[PDB]
Amino acid sequence: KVETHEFTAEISQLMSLIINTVYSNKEIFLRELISNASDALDKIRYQALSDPSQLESEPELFIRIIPQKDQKVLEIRDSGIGMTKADLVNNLGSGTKSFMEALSAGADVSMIGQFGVGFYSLFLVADHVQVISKHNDDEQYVWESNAGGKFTVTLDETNERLGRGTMLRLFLKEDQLEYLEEKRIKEVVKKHSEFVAYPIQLVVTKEVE
């Protein structure tokens, strides 16, 4: 059963801004999303210093990028802490207002991650997103959205089990399909995410002839 919720007004306004801006360095979306993954992996790793059974839901700590060319979808999966349904309905934090203000004063989009709202840079290159997530002691959910208006949260009894962590599915814009290319992904990872302290896997798929 689907639950529908409205974005705060400032989030809808941020989305509309990002999805329509003409920024010439849109590749930074991948850095912002890998930084969120890294942070989520740090959080589970450090909780597990007190309580190592927290890692049992998925013993590997990794980041995994899966272009799906048939679907025009770029997936980014991590085995970090994940998000509770509460994180998914009410959000985490106000970073959103503080970043539109910042843009007003000439701030660069590349600085979105200083304000904790790096997730939304994905709308530089995508017009729809699914967030699949699984937190310890809660269920697996799909959060889904176009850019502005409503988002939905749905109990996930259909998809592959994450074990623990998060998978973003970016539905790429027709002008940004280069982020399905292996060499483009590799060089953007190496340029902006060179010092991430977790392995970054990239899946290349030979599709059936």
Q: Which residues bind ligand 99B (CB under 6 A)?
A: 5, 7-8, 11, 36-37, 39-40, 43, 78, 80-81, 83, 87-88, 90-92, 119, 131, 143, 166
Name the nearest CA neighbour of 143 among 186, 195, 82, 98: 82
17 by Cβ neighbours in 10 Å (0-12 / 13-18 / 19+) ranks as middle
Which residues are documented as binding site for ATP? 36, 78, 119
Residues making up the annotated binding site are 36, 78, 119
The minimum distance between CB 90 and ligand 99B, in angstroms, equals 6
Are the C-beta atoms of 75 and 167 separated by less than 8 Å?
yes
**Beta carbon nearer to ligand 99B, 92 or 204:** 92
In whole angstroms, how close is the CB of 72 to ligand 99B at the nearest point?
20
Q: Name the residue with tokens 């939304």.
A: 120
**Beta strands per DSSP E along the chain:** 2-6, 63-68, 73-78, 126-134, 140-145, 150-155, 165-172, 200-202
Please identify, using beta-carbon distances, which residue of 102 and 206 lies nearer to ligand 99B: 102
CB-wise, 179 or 183, nearer to ligand 99B? 179
* CB atoms inside a 10 Å sphere around CB 123: 26
Q: How far is the CB of 179 from ligand 99B (least distance, A)?
A: 17
Tell me how far apart the alpha carbons of residues 201 and 209 are, in angstroms, rounded to a whole number.
25
Least separation in angstroms between residue 107's CB and ligand 99B is 19
- As a whole number of angstroms, the distance between CA 39 and CA 46 comes to 11
Q: How far apart, in whole angstroms, are the C-alpha atoms of residue 116 and residue 105?
A: 18
Which residue's CB is nearer to ligand 99B, number 90 or number 201?
90
Judged by CB, which is closer to ligand 99B: 65, or 70?
65
Closest residue to ligand 99B, judged by C-beta, is: 40
The nearest distance, CB 158 to ligand 99B, in angstroms, is 19
